[PDB]
Structure formats: C-alpha cells, structure tokens
From a paper:
We recently characterized a novel roseophage, vB_DshS-R4C (R4C), that could infect the Dinoroseobacter shibae DFL12T, a ubiquitous group of Gram-negative α-proteobacteria of the Roseobacter clade. Here, we report the atomic capsid and in-situ structures of the tail machine of the marine siphophage, vB_DshS-R4C (R4C), which infects Roseobacter. The R4C virion, comprising 12 distinct structural protein components, has a unique five-fold vertex of the icosahedral capsid that allows genome delivery. In this study, we use cryo-electron microscopy (cryo-EM) and structure prediction to determine the atomic structure of the phage R4C capsid and the in-situ structure of the tail machinery to characterize the distinguished long rigid tail.
A density map of the tail tube at 3.43 Å resolution was obtained using helical reconstruction. The map showed a spiral architecture with an axial rise of ~40 Å and a twist of 30°. We then solved the atomic model of TTP, finding conservation in the main bodies of TTPs among R4C, SPP1, T4 and RcGTA, with a similar twisted β-sandwich extending a long β-hairpin. The helical tail tube has an outer diameter of ~85 Å and a wide inner corridor of ~43 Å that displays a strong negative electrostatic potential, as observed in other TTPs, and likely facilitates DNA traffic into the host. The aspartate (e.g., D27 and D108) and glutamate (e.g., E32 and E57) residues lining the tunnel form a negatively charged, almost parallel helical track through the tail tube, equidistant spacing of ~16 Å. Given that this value is close to the mean spacing of DNA minor and major grooves, we speculate that DNA becomes confined between the tracks and can therefore migrate quickly along the right-handed helical trajectory due to the electrostatic repulsion during DNA translocation. The inter-monomer interactions within the same TTP disc are dominated by backbone hydrogen bonds between the β-sheet layers, with two electrostatic networks for assisted binding. Specifically, β5 of one TTP interacts with β2 from the adjacent subunit, forming an anti-parallel β-sheet and an extensive hydrogen-bonding network. This results in an integrated 24-stranded β-barrel structure for one tail tube disc. Interactions between layers involve extensive hydrophobic interactions, with the long loop of TTP in the upper layer interacting with three TTPs from the lower layers of disc.
Author numbering:
A (entry chain G), B (entry chain I), C (entry chain Q), D (entry chain O), E (entry chain M), F (entry chain K), ...: 1 to 130
C-alpha cells in the first residue's frame, strides 16, 4: 500500500521533476491470437507483440519542465509510484514518445494540462532504487 | 451466501497468495449459431466453442508476488471464492494467459494495479477443497 | 400488480428451484422488413422470425442447483413471476440454451453469479398453473 | 398543458383499455437527402418517406388485455394523451405492428412489461374526440 | 447576458407564437477537408459547404400552432433569443424543413413534444429587430 | 498555478476581447505509425503530422465581437491563460479556422454560445508577452 | 410486394416441397442481332431464341427431397414466389435440367447446398393458382 | 436537381405506370474509329453509329403491368425522371426491345424483378411535357 | 440442419482423420450441349459427362496425416458432413486425385494449408453409415 | 493544393458553365513499343502516338447547357481545376468528341448524368488565364 | 498449430536470415489431363508435371540481405514455418529462381518490398531439423 | 524500417524535388521460359530479359516541376525511399520514359495527378548516398 501522494515523475534525460502533478497512469498490452478446428471443445491462444502507454495531468504553468513537452518529442521517463526513498521500485521507460497534449480551463478552475505518451521500440523496465 | 471478504487467489505453480486484493472476476462463454428456412416460425441455435476470461485488482506493492506478473506469462491460477476452509469450492484454471496490466494512481488515493488475463487451451475446472 | 418478491424459477427437467435469486428477465423479438417504391408516402413492414432470451442473477453458492448450470447445456425452464400459487401464470421455455455465465465478487459484497441463456427451436409457452 | 396522469391507451379492434400503465411514447420520422455541386455555398435537402414508432410500459399482470399482445400481431391502437373527455385530441394508428416485448423483475420491485411496436403502411391520424 | 426566459419562436409564414416552450437550440456547420504531402510538418484544411439544424421542446396541447407542425412541412421560422423588444437580434431561417416529431408522457409528468428540423437551401440570416 | 479566472481571448486581426467567457480549451496531436516483424519483442512507432483544435463557450450577446464569428471564417487568435500581465505566456494561433457554432438556451438559464475551431496550415506558436 | 419469406418450391413430378430453403432465383434471355449499312444513323436489332436458368440454396440434410437431386436429372419444377395461397402466381417450368450441385461447409456454419439448373426445350409458363 | 423519388415510367402503348419501382437507368453510345499515319503526333477519330440501353428494377407482383413484360416484346416506353408535372422533360423511346428479365428473392427480403431492355431502329427522343 | 462443426474427413486407405480442419467443399458438374434450328422458339439441351472437385483447409502441422498429402497422389476419401454417428450420410470418393497444395502464413496468424483435389474415373458415391 | 470545390467546366464554343457538377477527370496516353535482340540485358522502348480522354458527372436537369450534350457532338471544352481567378491554369481541349452519356436514378437519390468524351485530332493545350 | 510469428526464412547459400518479414507463401501444382470416349459416364484424369512458387514481403531496408535479391538470381532457400527449434519441419528449395520485386510506399506507411520467386528444375524437399 | 514519410523523388537532369507527393512505387521483372520432355518429373525454367516500371501520385499544382512532365518525355529519376540523409540508399533510373498521366478531382477533394512511367534501355541502379 504505497502512499500515492508521493508519486514523482522525472525527465531522465535532463533530470528535473515535472511539477504540480495530479495523476499518472501506465499500461502494458500484448495482442492475442485464437484458433480452433472442426471438432474441438475449447479454443487456443497466444500473445504476439507488446506495447505500453500512459499519461499524466498537471497544473498548467509556463515556467516548468512540463512546458517543454511537445508532441513528437522523444523523452526518457522514470515513474516513482511511491517516492524516491531507497528501496522504492520505479518503472523507467526508454524512448517514450509523446503523442498529444490537451490544455483547458474553466471560469472557476485551474488551467490543466494532459500529456499523453506512448512507447517506441522498448518496454518499461522495472527496477529498485538504491 | 459466501462471505466475499475471504476470497483468496493463488499462483498455483509457485504457491503464493497474491496480496492486497480488491476484487476478482471470472467469465465463461460459448459462441452461438442461428439458422432458419423460408417458412419457419422460430429460429434454431447451438453452441460451438468456449472461452474464459477475468481479472483482478490489487494495491500496487513492488515486494509482492503480484509484481512478477508480466503480460505474456503463462500461470496456473486457483480462485477461492469463499476462502481455503475445507469443503469450499475453488475454480482452478490451467494455462492462464496474462494479457495486460494497468497501473495508476491519484493525488489522494493508493496506487492500484489491474491484471487482466485469459485462458489458452483449457477451461476452468471446478473442484472441492479437502 | 404481482408481488415481485415471490418470483420462482425452476429447472423443469429435474424439478428443483434455483436458489438465492436476485432478479430475472425475459424477452421476445421478431425481425422486421421494410420496403417502398418510387412515389409512396409511407413504408410497409412485416415480421419474419422470432427469438427469445433472458438471464437471472443469483448469489454464488456451490451447494445449489444453480451450480450445475454450464455454458452449452440444454435445460427446460419455468418462470413463475408471481409465485406458485394456483392460477398464477408461468412462462415455460422448452430447450433453453445456456450461453454464458459470469461470476464476480468485491471486497465488501457477496459473490454473485449471472446466468445468461437463449432459446433454440421453441418459443416461450404461456400457461396457467392449476 | 395536459395532465399526463390521465393518459389512456386502447386496443381499438376489441375496445379495452390496456391496464396499469406507466409511460407511453410515440415518434414520426422522414428520411432526408442532401446534395450540392462544385461551387455552391449551402446544401439542399428534402424528405422522402415516413415512419412511426413507439412503446409503452405496464405492470405485468396475466389477467389483462396487455397479456394478449404478442410479437407479430397487428393491432389498431388509439392514444389519448389527455384522457377521453370530449374535445381531447387522440392519435389513432391503424395497422400497428407489435415488434417485441420484454418482461423483467427485481427482488424489490414489481414485474414490468415493455411492449414495443411500429407502423406498417399507414401513419398516425390525429383527430378530436366528440 | 440575455434573460433566456423571454425566448420567443414564431412561424413567420402565418405569424403566431409557438406556445408553452421549454427549450430551443440551433447549430451551424461546415465540412472540413485536410491534406498533406510526404515531408510536411502540419496539415492544411478548408471548409466546403454549410448546414443548419436545431429543435425545440413544448408542452403537448392540441389547440396550438405547435400542433400543425408535421414532418415534411416547409416553414419559415424566426427565433428571438432575448424577446421581441426593439434592438434584440433574431435569427430568421427561410425554408426550414421539419424532419421529425416525438411525443411522450409519464405517469407523473406533462405530455411533451419535441420538434426537430433542418435547413434546406438557405442559411440562418441574423438581423436586428426595429 | 495560474488563476484561471483571468483568461483572456482576443481576435488578433481586429484587436478586441471576446466577451463573457465561460471556458476555453486547446489541443495538439500527431498521428502515430507502428510496425514490427516476425520475431520481434516490442513494436516501433513514430509521429507523422500534427494538428490543433479547441473551442470556447460564451454568453450569447448580439452586441459583441463574439457575434461576428461565422463558420468558415479565418481568424487570428491569441489565448492568454493567465491574463495579459507582462511575462504571461500566450498561445497565438495563426489562420484559425472556425468550424461550427451551437447556440442554445433553457427556461431557467442564460443563452449560451459554443464556438468550435481548428487550425489550417500552421501550429500554435507559444510566446511570452512583454 | 410479396412477403418473400413464404416462397415455396416443389418437385412437381413427385409432389414434395424442397426443404430448408435460403434463396431462389430465375432468369430469361433472348439473343440479339444487330446490323447497319453504310450511311445509317442508328442500328437495328431483333431477338432470335430464348432460354431460362436459375438456382436455389438449401441447408444440407440427407433426409430430404433435396438430396435426390443429381446432375443430369430431368425434373418438373414449380416456384411459388408468394406462397401457395389461392390467387398467387407461380412459374412452372417443364423439363428442367439440373446442371450442377455444390456442397460446402465451414467450422462455424451450417452445411449448405446449391443446386443450379437450366431449361431444355420449354420455357417457364406463368399461371395463377386456384 | 430533380427529386429522384418522383420518377415515373410508363408503357406508352397501353398507358399504365409500371408499379413499385426501385431504380431506372439509361444509356447512349456511339462507336469510335481511330487512325493515324507514319509521322503523325496525335490520332484522329469519329463516331459511326449509335445505340441505347437501360433497365429498371421493381418489386415482384403478379397483378401489375410489370408482369406482362416478356423477353422479345416490343414496347413504347416513356421515362419521367422528375415526375409528370408540366414542364418536366421526359425521354420517350420508340420500339424498345425487352431483352431479359431476372426474378430473385431471399429469406429476408422482397421478391425483386429486373427488366433489361434495348433499342431497335430508333433513338431516345427528348421532349418537354405540356 | 447438420451441426457443421462435427464434419470429419478421413483417408479411407489408411484410416486416419485429417486434423485441425477449417472448412471443406465439394462439387459436381455435367457439361451441357445446346442446339436449335431455323424457326424454333426455344433451344434444347442435354448433359454429356460428369466430374467432381473440392478442397479443404487445415492448420499446418508437420506431425499429421495432412502432411503426407502430395500433389499427384491417389487417395480414397470419405467426407462426413454431420459426423460419424450412425445414420449420418457420408460421401465417399474413390480414386481422388490431389492436384495442388498451398501453404501460407502471416505475422499475426496460424500457418494454414489448402489441399485441392479432383476425381479421376469415378464419381462420389453417397451412402449411409451403419 | 487547389481547392477542388471551385472547379469550373465550360463549353468554349457557346460560353456557358455546365451546371451542378460532381466530379471531372482527364487523361493522356502514348502507346509504347518494345524490342530486344538475342543477347541483350534490358529491353528498349519508345512512344508512338498520343490520345486524351475524360468525363464528368452532373445532376440531371433538363434546363441546363448540360442537356444539349449528345453523343457524336463536337465541342470545345475548357477545364478550370482551380476556378477562373487570374493566374489559374486551365486545360483547353479543341475538338472534343462526346462519346456516350448515361443517366440513372434511385428511389432515394438524385438523377445523375455521366458524360464521357474523347479527343479527335488535337491534344489538351495547357495555358494560364489572364 | 504452429505459432506463425516465429517463421524464419534463410538464404541457404550464404547463411543469413532475411530481415523484417511480414508474410510468406508457398505453392505446389501438377497439371491435369482429362479424356473420355463416346459412351462413358465419368471422365478420367492424371497429373503430368509439377512446379512450385511463392513469395514474401519485407520492410524495405538497404542494409539487409533482403537488398541483394535481384530478379534473375539463383538462390537456395529454406523456410522455417515454426522457427528453428529442433524437430521443426522446414521446406528447403534448391535452385530457387527470383522472378520479380516490387517496392512501394505511402505517405503514412513503411516502405515495403515484395519478392516473388519460382522453382527451376527441383521441387521443395521437406525435412526435419535436428 | 524506413520512415516512409520522408521519401523524396527528384528530376536528376534539372535537380528539383517533385512536390506534394502522396505515394510512389517501383517494380522489376524478368520473363520466364519453361520446358520439359516426355518422362520428366519437374519442369525447368530460366529468365530472359528484364524491365522496370512504377508511378507516383501528387497533388495537382500548376506551379511545380511536376507540371512539366508530359507523356513521351525522357527524364532521369532518383528515388530516395528514406530521405536524403547520408548513407540512405537511393534507386537511380536513367532514361526513364514517362508513359501516361491522369488528372482528376471530386467535389470534396483535392485535384490529384498520377504520373506513370517506364524504363527504356537501362535498369534501376542501386547506390548509397554520401
């Protein structure tokens, strides 16, 4: 049961936390393939190839490392679900591909920014901080 | 009327409970085929081939057997809906295929993990614990 | 205005009530066919062939006749919307085809089971109990 | 502003109110066709052919004229939105085609029935009761 | 900031307000077309042809000018968002094509009517009442 | 953390604030392309071409610069998320293409207007006001 | 506008409906001959000799009169496009020549049979059932 | 822009509309002849002789003037693309030669009939109805 | 209405089912001959000589009796459209000539094999299993 | 990147736009001739003589200059792919030979006309409008 | 049921896998010869001579062994449908004749290459890897 | 795996990129010759002579080097599948013969141009840019 309010995201290439974070997310998939013949009871399957994707939502501030993210950039990410304290696992993604951003606001809210990324060629490598 | 808060899931291959569980689910299907002729009142049907699928949601903790689950792995599962007390039925699935995982968090919550699996070649075999 | 809390479902073949029931449902359809010509005001229609389908949700208990239901089985059903008291209509379905089941649970609930069936060759025959 | 709780539906062929009604509905449509050329500012349209459809929901009671409705029947309907008092408009539909029914219940409710119909060859003819 | 409760709709051809109104709506669109070549950074666009559409919902009363609206009719509309007081802009639509109507009711409500229209050949012409 | 209630939008061509604003929004995308061969573990990707889109919602008033916006117009926009005070970043979009508008009202509300635009040939150019 | 789902085909010689029918078809042709001279504006034509052909597709069942059809057989057919009710026209073909059959199936379908015939010496004689 | 749903076809000889029409079609051709010499840049051409052809598809009904059409008949046709209202052009074909018919049906459709004709000696003469 | 998913094919010479089947097919033909004289209304026909042909598609597995099939082999086949249960008709072909095979695969599929055969000297002999 | 919705076609002889256009097309070809000797690696080629062809599709209206087009006519065409604004290239074809026309309609469409032409003796001469 | 995503192709002469593969295919044929006499029921056949052919599609990369393939080359191929693991059958073709290649691309795709080959003098020799 | 959206085509003679490209394509062939004798098992083959062909599709713009391409011209081409960056292979074709062009448009599209060429005397010479 990790705290959840200690989550830290970093741009690994430049070494700088994101900023006013609100939520993160991650995912992993593999495609399936199913087949069966005339006279079988159950159908078989297997997994071909894998992906990864995720996003995060921050408060919009122009003076942040969150501002430099632009669609099409390649960035090395590190997600700390439980903080940076030693022994806390962190998923590090190499070659993360930023796909789209979406800024918005309301008459009674704070301008928010949603970055949405993807993986390109590599998969999230789990690890344990020292 | 089983308790519901006693549900236990196990990795049958290695023999280790999952961890901080939140909910599980299971399913079974068979495809249908319908036909009728010119001049019939009702249409006929039958079932061809079967499947199974399900998922479960846990609290994210790196030091757990829940962490070793990766998309594409083949694992032997056992679901105890009412606990491990003798005489409690348990659905055991052989060759379960883990298909996708999805980790997430919020600024006021606990990091959660959703594993989502499938069956490959075999179907859930009901039984009764000794 | 039937009571609704007296509803009874039976496996007609073996003669045994289902168990801890939560809700039932039923349906009937007929396909439509519409046509019109160049210079018509309204379009005509008619009904070709009929079906039936429904489901029900029970509390999961292994020691019940609800447990023996498996996808692909053929079972003779009888639905008593208002109980078994004499003069209460009951829809009896012959050759009901059970299509899928879906068991689930939560950390603060009761394990539930949803059976989902269909009709194959026959249609629900209304009647009046003696 | 009609009362709404006085709505009466009738089977015009046999002359018998439906029963414990809960809600009714009606509709009318005409298909559209749009076209434009290279160099036009706005696009033109027109309406080809018309339909009608609707439904109503009643409490399930076997001893009612609502029970005799079966998918595929042809029935002459009359809808009184504001009651049967003189001078109250009523939409009368000839050759209404009943398309599907759907009975259901819950463990804490009343068994309900939803009839769903259509029009075949004719359109709803408004009128004013004497 | 117009009042919103003063909105008036008229049938311009005959000169008669609608009746017990509940809400109106309007819309305008133009289709887009996008293209790009091998080696471009951004994609270009432009707008081809335009439309208009909208609806309104009234209380069902047979003795109203709202009753004469039938699918397929051509009517000249005028929408006064802020009333008929001098200097209040009003969108006047010529050749409005009424496409569908949908009457309904409940056991504890008022019978309502939803008219749904379109434009055919012309576009809404803004203006300012004298 | 920008205030959010100070957001200002301008028509850059004519130099005039919009009016009673309620909310704005913006977006940027780039399409993705994925490929893999027989015998690969992960799938590769890259981004081809980019877009931009957004909208904003105002109170409907005929005597405003918001009224002159018509579908199909080309307008130069400037969005000030945090006001016009010096040092506040503003996204300026050149050649913004207005795509659709949607006016509406209720019996207990204020007539609202939703403008919905797009970009054509250029992308939002961030900057910092002097 | 005949129903289409009432179509009946018969072997007139033995008097037995076909079986589970799916679709029928028929055709009639006459060859053309065109000629023109040096200095003519349009070309002339006429029709020499006529034929007939068609087919039908049934569900494959060995215990049917559909099974006895073999390529090369001569059979007297009668096609009822709208059923056998009195006053319904039926095309009766004498000396129909069955030319080819084609049985097939899939892993998720019903074995189907396509009979394909021709006419030999006579042409389809329309009539009206008594 | 003619309506298209008002198209009327007539047998000019007997004066009777066809019936439930679905679509019509027409055509005109002239053969080409090309030649060139040793040392020319472009090739020359001209048109020798002309034809006409077309078809139409109706719902199959034995009690119609559509039923009397048989391959080999000579019939005088008139096609009204936009109806019979005065001032609407109509292509009248003299000596139309009916070449083939093709009736068909499905288990969920309406029996359709496709007549296919030709011209013999004359060409379609355009005109304007009075 | 045979099940279709129970179809069994056998090599009659060695007595061994094929394997993972996907679909089968069969055919029978006879050539036609048509003639007519100067002054006849319809043309006559008859059938000269017959053939047979078909195929089937299996999943590619080297350890199967499907693997031993090579183009040019002579094999005795038996097709069970509805299984091997007693009373189920089966078409037995003697001297079947295997004509061609075609193996293929995709990056996300299962390697498939299509055998395509013919008959040589004999025709399919229908029968009924004991 | 020309707009495409501004395309204008003209009859150059009489000076009158076509009408409700839907699409145009054009083409140019030259025949090829290939040869090689005993002992050559690649084969040679060259182009002998050229042609041109194209078509266009309009909405059928009798009161248009599109109506006067008849197969066999010689007409001087001018195609403006991007409109008639100054500096817009236009392909002018002299002695265009109209080869065939094809009118058609549907029960839910607009009567369309497809003109199909050719070139005779001359080739399309590109130019630039003043 | 081989995996299908493990398929490996090799140039046997030089010993080097192809590269980014997408799909392969193979085929075998033998010509047929049919004859019959005046007075026979069925027609006889036999197979004369055999061939082989196939292709495969790869991603275009100049730095690959796929690049060295040129039309007219003679290459020794080996196809591993299920990978190179021991006991996996592989079809080895000697003297494969590469017949044609076809490179292509799109504005939103990956440049692909399709090699298309044939056999010359020898036939595919099945085997089993050690 | 080349990007595919970076493809560049050049007119090598004048040194000027084409323009708004959409897709390219290329091909190479060699004819085959097969022979066999009375008493052989497989048939032999070989390749005689080679060709090349391809095309590409661009947006129609008169102010481009794409406009100067005319059927019959001889042009020296260079295709860069992966761009002009150093080390990227490019197929250079000498003496390319342009065979035909085909311009077209729609009422909701962009005027497109398809050039279609051939090779004359030489074959595509692969290379590697410096």
């Amino acid at each position: 049961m990790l705290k959840g309010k200690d989550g830290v995201v970093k741009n690994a290439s430049t070494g700088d936390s994101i900023g006013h974070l609100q939520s993160w997310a991650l995912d992993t998939q593999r495609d399936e393939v199913s087949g069966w013949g005339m006279g079988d009871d159950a159908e078989r399957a297997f997994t071909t190839v894998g992906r990864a994707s995720g996003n995060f939502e921050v408060y919009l501030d122009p003076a942040d490392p969150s501002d430099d993210l632009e669609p099409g950039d390649l960035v090395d990410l590190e997600l700390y679900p439980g903080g940076e304290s030693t022994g806390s696992g962190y998923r590090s993604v190499a070659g993360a591909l930023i796909l789209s951003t979406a800024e918005s606001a309301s008459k009674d809210g704070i301008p928010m920014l949603t970055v949405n990324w993807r993986t390109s060629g590599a998969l999230p490598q789990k690890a344990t901080v020292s």
